[PDB]
Amino acid sequence: ACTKNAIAQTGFNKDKYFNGDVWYVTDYLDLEPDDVPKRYCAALAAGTASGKLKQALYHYDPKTQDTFYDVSELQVESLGKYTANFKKVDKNGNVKVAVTAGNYYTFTVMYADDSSALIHTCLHKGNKDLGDLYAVLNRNKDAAAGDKVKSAVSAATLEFSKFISTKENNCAYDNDSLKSLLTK
């Protein structure tokens, strides 16, 4: 179960975050692990498509090869805090699992600048029991977490030393598919 009400960044700049570009997860902290593997690759694109607030997601397990993409429209709870349904899609946006009641995630942007972000997400999916997930994002897939985002981790009363890095997993991403999924 999720236990945190994450606080969105004061003065969050929504147009900069939702600019249509790709974010890569470089480090993550799951408050309920054996929630997720110890090795993982994830990325997203976020933008406004025909007036609608969207995110496309990519997950890859580099050991099992389990791969999936999702498209989400984001509903606004408050600035920097969103509730998103999701549909599972192939990389071309064809629907594999439709939007469904009970399948949604919350998404809070705790910190963001032009290059980096810290987010919280609580996933709800059927009758699974899932927990709080924090993710450090970067516009560059290879970027070590810099001082601004590491300080934000501290300011959220978390320890960056506990975050698990995705950098050793040889992650390769289809940026083109993530961007085009925003429209789907």
| Known binding-site positions for heme | 59
Binding to ligand HEM in span 119-178, by CB under 6 A: 121, 123, 125, 128, 133, 135
Letter string b/e over residues 98-115, b meaning 16 or more CB atoms within 10 A of that residue's CB: eeeeebbbbbbbbbbeee
Binding of ligand NH3 by 123 (CB under 6 A): yes
Nearest CB to ligand HEM, comparing residues 90 and 114: 90
Among 86, 111, 120, 163, binds ligand HEM (CB under 6 A): 86
- Per-residue binding string, ligand HEM, 11-50, x by CB under 6 A, is --------------x--x-x-----x---x-x-x------
Total chain residues near ligand HEM (CB under 6 A): 22
Binding of ligand NH3 by 133 (CB under 6 A): yes
Phi/psi for 127 (5° steps) reads: -100, 25
Query: Under the rule (CB under 6 A), what is the footprint of ligand NH3?
Result: 123, 133
